[PDB]
Design a protein around this motif. Structure first.
Motif, PDB file in Angstrom:
ATOM      1  N   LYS A  48       0.829  -1.196   0.000  1.00 42.10           N
ATOM      2  CA  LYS A  48       0.000   0.000   0.000  1.00 42.10           C
ATOM      3  C   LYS A  48       0.867   1.251   0.000  1.00 42.10           C
ATOM      4  O   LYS A  48       1.885   1.325   0.695  1.00 42.10           O
ATOM      5  CB  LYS A  48      -0.935   0.000   1.214  1.00 42.10           C
ATOM      6  CG  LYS A  48      -2.011  -1.108   1.220  1.00 42.10           C
ATOM      7  CD  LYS A  48      -2.915  -1.140  -0.030  1.00 42.10           C
ATOM      8  CE  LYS A  48      -3.643   0.180  -0.293  1.00 42.10           C
ATOM      9  NZ  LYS A  48      -4.470   0.122  -1.530  1.00 42.10           N
ATOM     10  N   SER A  49       0.455   2.234  -0.797  1.00 40.69           N
ATOM     11  CA  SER A  49       1.221   3.459  -0.974  1.00 40.69           C
ATOM     12  C   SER A  49       1.301   4.260   0.324  1.00 40.69           C
ATOM     13  O   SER A  49       0.533   4.059   1.268  1.00 40.69           O
ATOM     14  CB  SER A  49       0.592   4.324  -2.065  1.00 40.69           C
ATOM     15  OG  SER A  49       0.544   3.633  -3.301  1.00 40.69           O
ATOM     16  N   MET A  50       2.266   5.174   0.355  1.00 41.66           N
ATOM     17  CA  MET A  50       2.411   6.081   1.482  1.00 41.66           C
ATOM     18  C   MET A  50       1.270   7.105   1.477  1.00 41.66           C
ATOM     19  O   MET A  50       0.828   7.528   0.405  1.00 41.66           O
ATOM     20  CB  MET A  50       3.765   6.791   1.394  1.00 41.66           C
ATOM     21  CG  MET A  50       4.121   7.708   2.564  1.00 41.66           C
ATOM     22  SD  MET A  50       5.666   8.606   2.294  1.00 41.66           S
ATOM     23  CE  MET A  50       6.866   7.277   2.188  1.00 41.66           C
ATOM     24  N   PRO A  51       0.767   7.537   2.664  1.00 39.77           N
ATOM     25  CA  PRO A  51      -0.178   8.667   2.678  1.00 39.77           C
ATOM     26  C   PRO A  51       0.482   9.992   2.327  1.00 39.77           C
ATOM     27  O   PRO A  51       1.649  10.030   1.927  1.00 39.77           O
ATOM     28  CB  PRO A  51      -0.701   8.678   4.122  1.00 39.77           C
ATOM     29  CG  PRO A  51      -0.442   7.324   4.638  1.00 39.77           C
ATOM     30  CD  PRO A  51       0.834   6.901   3.994  1.00 39.77           C
ATOM     31  N   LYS A  52      -0.263  11.091   2.475  1.00 42.70           N
ATOM     32  CA  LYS A  52       0.307  12.419   2.274  1.00 42.70           C
ATOM     33  C   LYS A  52       1.323  12.807   3.349  1.00 42.70           C
ATOM     34  O   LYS A  52       1.973  13.848   3.207  1.00 42.70           O
ATOM     35  CB  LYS A  52      -0.819  13.460   2.191  1.00 42.70           C
ATOM     36  CG  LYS A  52      -1.419  13.556   0.788  1.00 42.70           C
ATOM     37  CD  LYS A  52      -2.607  14.506   0.685  1.00 42.70           C
ATOM     38  CE  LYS A  52      -3.074  14.610  -0.764  1.00 42.70           C
ATOM     39  NZ  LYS A  52      -4.338  15.382  -0.927  1.00 42.70           N
ATOM     40  N   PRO A  87      10.254  10.498   1.146  1.00 49.35           N
ATOM     41  CA  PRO A  87       9.231  11.471   0.746  1.00 49.35           C
ATOM     42  C   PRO A  87       8.161  11.674   1.809  1.00 49.35           C
ATOM     43  O   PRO A  87       7.844  10.778   2.595  1.00 49.35           O
ATOM     44  CB  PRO A  87       8.629  10.849  -0.519  1.00 49.35           C
ATOM     45  CG  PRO A  87       8.747   9.404  -0.294  1.00 49.35           C
ATOM     46  CD  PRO A  87      10.035   9.205   0.464  1.00 49.35           C
ATOM     47  N   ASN A  88       7.616  12.896   1.831  1.00 56.07           N
ATOM     48  CA  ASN A  88       6.548  13.316   2.751  1.00 56.07           C
ATOM     49  C   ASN A  88       6.907  13.107   4.226  1.00 56.07           C
ATOM     50  O   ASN A  88       6.017  13.066   5.081  1.00 56.07           O
ATOM     51  CB  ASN A  88       5.230  12.598   2.437  1.00 56.07           C
ATOM     52  CG  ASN A  88       4.779  12.798   1.005  1.00 56.07           C
ATOM     53  OD1 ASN A  88       5.146  13.779   0.357  1.00 56.07           O
ATOM     54  ND2 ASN A  88       3.974  11.869   0.504  1.00 56.07           N
TER      55      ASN A  88
END
Ligand SMILES: [Zn+2]
Lengths: 12, 82, 264
Positions: free
Chosen positions: B60-64, C68-69
């Motif tokens: 699952k992708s990273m959140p913001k 990132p982020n």
DNA sequence: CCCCCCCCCCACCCCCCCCCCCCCCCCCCCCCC
DNA sequence: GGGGGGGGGGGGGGGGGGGGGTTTGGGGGGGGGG
């Protein structure tokens, strides 16, 4: 197996 | 292990080893040799315990925002205790 | 030029306005530098705010981390300037008197904060400015007619050697007494008593005070009211009123909040 | 001077956003020249 | 021994779906009349 990555405190 | 009674269990471990170091080099049987080795493994392990790595699933992708913190200590421990 | 006369040509120019301060905000913090800390590696970096926009770093600066982020804003390690907003009114002196005075918001910054207070007539010199305002804070949508304000860069309201030279004079009692109201008949016991009221006594904290209090009796057909008028002009921080129908609370303090009356 | 009055104050569509999927690019490894 | 081509991973874009956006009574203060 579950594709995953390890994040390490010692490189802080 | 390190804190309790100033770590008196550490002296317990060396005393258990001393009670086979007293006897002769040959008189230390395979069981005595193993017991001394296990005492060394105890001290090694007590040195060796260290906080684990925060290991994340990547399907699952990273959140913001990224991981909120890498801190993996249990609540009753501070890093100075370790 | 008058507040009523500002127009779209002025919108980036420097202008100068005369007006009356109605009221001011408290000091408002304005972020000048943001402070970003990495959630992974605890590295920190600083970002100057550009035209009100935080130029957030999308990835961590350290190439050995570069997640990132992962950066987050540490609010109380950001660096802040001071801002204050003041409601400046067109004076009732200058209006076409059949209709209301206008007012304009002004922004004042850093140590120019609290340079003036409610009831101050001032000049303010600043850039005229305009900004859009959102139709709803949940959206980027803007209303067509901009808000306007002046962004100020200067403000203005509305020795002992000489003092020592006068102090040696022999007529000085009468000299100061005549000066309080030379336009009124000389009445110099009244003027001398008032001069002592202007001097005042001294104080001791262990109660008593170094005040002086005077009552002008005599007929209503005499100049004492004019003497009071000049003394009210002379004193640094006095008040003038009159006692007929004067309420015990109106004279003093009145009611939510309590506000001070004339005597206070 | 005292009491009563009266005045004040208060309790359906469109945008932003997020999630999911697909393609393209860039690196690594192996083969060919 | 270097460069091309094949294969796999990782990132970015684009689309789709979803949720959000004034009267009535009471007390106390303040002022006016008997
Ligand atoms: Zn980092």
């Amino acid at each position: 197996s579950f594709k995953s990555r390890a994040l390490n405190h010692v490189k802080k | 292990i390190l804190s309790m009674e100033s770590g008196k269990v550490l002296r317990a471990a060396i005393r258990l080893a001393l009670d086979v170091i007293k006897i002769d080099r040959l008189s230390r049987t395979p069981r005595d040799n193993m017991v001394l080795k296990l005492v060394l493994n105890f001290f090694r392990n007590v040195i060796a315990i260290e906080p684990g790595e925060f290991t994340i699933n990547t399907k699952k992708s990273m959140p913001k925002k990224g991981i909120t913190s890498i801190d993996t200590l249990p609540p009753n421990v501070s890093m100075d205790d370790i | 030029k008058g507040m009523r006369e500002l127009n779209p040509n002025d919108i980036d120019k420097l202008i100068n306005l005369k007006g009356l301060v109605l009221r001011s905000t408290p000091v408002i913090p304005d972020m000048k530098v943001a402070f970003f800390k990495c959630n992974v590696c605890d590295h920190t970096m600083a970002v100057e705010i550009d035209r009100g926009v935080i130029q957030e770093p999308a990835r961590c600066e350290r190439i050995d981390c570069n997640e990132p982020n992962s950066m987050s804003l540490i609010h109380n390690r950001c660096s802040f300037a001071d801002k204050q907003v003041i409601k400046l009114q067109e004076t009732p002196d200058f209006v076409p008197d059949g209709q209301t005075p206008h007012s304009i918001s002004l922004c004042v910054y850093d140590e120019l904060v609290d340079s003036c207070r409610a009831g101050d007539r001032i000049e303010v010199t600043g850039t005229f400015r305009s900004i859009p305002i959102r139709a709803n804070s949940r959206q980027r949508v803007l209303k067509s007619l901009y808000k306007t304000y002046v962004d100020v860069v200067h403000v203005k309201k509305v020795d002992l050697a000489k003092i020592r030279e006068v102090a040696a004079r022999e007529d000085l009692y009468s000299l100061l007494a005549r000066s309080i109201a030379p336009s009124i008949y000389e009445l110099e016991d009244v003027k001398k008593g008032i001069l002592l009221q202007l001097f005042g006594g001294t104080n001791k904290t262990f109660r008593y005070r170094g005040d002086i209090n005077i009552l002008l009796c005599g007929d209503p057909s005499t100049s004492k009211s004019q003497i009071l008028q000049y003394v009210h002009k002379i004193t640094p921080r006095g008040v003038y009123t009159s006692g007929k129908g004067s309420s015990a609370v109106g004279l003093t303090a009145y009611i939510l909040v309590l506000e001070s009356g004339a005597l206070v």
